[PDB]
Structure 1
Amino acid sequence: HWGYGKHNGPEHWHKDFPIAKGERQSPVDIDTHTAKYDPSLKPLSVSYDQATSLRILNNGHAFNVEFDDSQDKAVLKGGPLDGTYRLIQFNFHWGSLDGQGSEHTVDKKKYAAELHLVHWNTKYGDFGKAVQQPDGLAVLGIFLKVGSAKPGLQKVVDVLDSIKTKGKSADFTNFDPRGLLPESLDYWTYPGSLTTPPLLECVTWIVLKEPISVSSEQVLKFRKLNFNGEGEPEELMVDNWRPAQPLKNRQIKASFK
């Protein structure tokens, strides 16, 4: 089964998922001097006030917080998007050390972790259909750097102990995702893919310029999770990030100058 180890990591994925060597793979390195400022990009519209979180789960690769996506409660629109995109989940990627952990990089700079807020285009009916379309998903990427603590992330940090191993899940209601957003919504956007198998090329990536700060104690708790299931030899869940892929003549557009 795929993973992030020496024998089943990113460099091996192409054997089971040939699309890994595709034309629009993610993540990528964002070269800030080559990115094109596009004055026609509209501001992002994030409406998370009616968001309903359900559970938090350790899937053996990272941990996800899932939301009720049966209605337009938490949606993303505007920016480079056409139509309404419904929030379904958010997940993180982190490193074993503070100088690595993010998937996307900015001018080769790696951040301590990266948050992904996944949304699917409502015109497709369900998430399963959306992943088969070139404009099926919109993922909002937020960088995390170590500094002062992020109050809004603490609820997540505190519950990690209950979902320590692969397969564990816990009820996680009333979590407000607005507490994870940076102050500015300036962004870079480019057409890409999911960063984990099946690596489908169905994502419009929206990467925020401004990182959020989290404390050392907060990220330390992420590193306590396990890749393994209960009762198996312990493998700490760290470095669950995919390296930057070739841009291959796609253009990264910026909403700011």
Structure 2
Amino acid sequence: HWGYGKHNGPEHWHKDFPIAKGERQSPVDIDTHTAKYDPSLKPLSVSYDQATSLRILNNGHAFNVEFDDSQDKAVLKGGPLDGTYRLIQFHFHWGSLDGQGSEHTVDKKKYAAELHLVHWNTKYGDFGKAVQQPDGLAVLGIFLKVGSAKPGLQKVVDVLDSIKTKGKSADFTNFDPRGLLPESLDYWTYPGSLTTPPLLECVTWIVLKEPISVSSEQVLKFRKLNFNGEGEPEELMVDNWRPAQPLKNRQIKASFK
């Protein structure tokens, strides 16, 4: 099955998932000079006060923090979005070293990691139907740099020892994703895809300009996770990022002048 290694990684995905070579693949490099301020973007609304986290899962590619999306609690709206998008999960991509790990790049700069908060468009009823639509998903992407610790991340860090290997999960209730946001909501936006197989072209990407800082100790604990299952030879879960893909017939819009 697909992964991030030499024999199953991003350069192989197109064989099982030919959309990998499609017209609106993600991630992309964000050329800050070419991105254009868009006055038609409405204010972005990140409304996470009633979020209900449930569980954290090592899926063999990353770890997902899952939310109760059975009703409108944690939602994203405004900006480029038409209607209401409900938070279903978040996860990260990260590197083996601090100089790589992000999926999006900014003027070709790679960050140490990238957080993805995944939301589905409520007009389609469920996530599965949403991923059959060109506007089914909105992913809020947040870069991580290594510096001061992010206090709101520590609860995630401290549970990772209990989900070291593929297929392990743990209760993860009462986690507040507001503690993972930077101060500014300035963002870039463009139409793209899932960055993992099945690579479906359903996503409105909203990538925040301001990174969050996490400590070296925090990201080092991400790097102790395993891609493999329990009892199998250890393959550290590192470098679980897809590189930038061709922009093709797309423009990146900026929320800020």
Measure the CA separation in 1 of the matches of 2:14 and 2:47: 37
Measure the CA separation in 2 of the matches of 1:249 and 1:134: 15
Measure the CA separation in 1 of the matches of 2:183 and 2:216: 21
Measure the CA separation in 1 of the matches of 2:245 and 2:43: 27
Distance apart, 1:36 and its partner CA: 1.0
Distance apart, 1:39 and its partner CA: 1.2
Show the counterpart of 1:66.
66
SS across alignment from 2:250: coil
CA offsets 1:187-244 (integer angstroms, 9 cap, x no match): 0000000000000000000000000000000000000000000011100000000000
SS across alignment from 1:89: strand
Distance apart, 1:10 and its partner CA: 0.1
CA offsets 1:25-69 (integer angstroms, 9 cap, x no match): 000000000001111111210110000000000000000000000
Tell me which moved more, 164-173 or 41-50: 41-50
Give the RMSD, CA atoms, in angstroms.
0.4
Distance apart, 1:105 and its partner CA: 0.1
Measure the CA separation in 2 of the matches of 1:132 and 1:19: 14
Measure the CA separation in 2 of the matches of 1:179 and 1:243: 27
SS across alignment from 2:183: coil
SS across alignment from 2:11: helix
Measure the CA separation in 2 of the matches of 1:7 and 1:133: 31
Measure the CA separation in 2 of the matches of 1:18 and 1:93: 23
Distance apart, 1:88 and its partner CA: 0.1
Distance apart, 1:131 and its partner CA: 0.6
Show the counterpart of 1:254.
254
Runs of 4+ residues over 6 Å off in structure 1: none
Q: Mind listing any 5+ residue stretches in structure 2 that lack a counterpart?
A: none
Measure the CA separation in 1 of the matches of 2:47 and 2:205: 18
Distance apart, 1:249 and its partner CA: 1.9
SS across alignment from 2:99: coil
Show the counterpart of 2:177.
177
CA offsets 1:108-165 (integer angstroms, 9 cap, x no match): 0000000000000000000000011000000000000000000000000000000000
Q: Mind listing any 5+ residue stretches in structure 1 that lack a counterpart?
A: none
Measure the CA separation in 2 of the matches of 1:252 and 1:186: 13
The normalised TM-score by structure 2 is 1.00
Show the counterpart of 2:111.
111
Measure the CA separation in 1 of the matches of 2:141 and 2:132: 21
SS across alignment from 1:213: strand
Provide the aligned length of Structure 1 versus Structure 2: 257
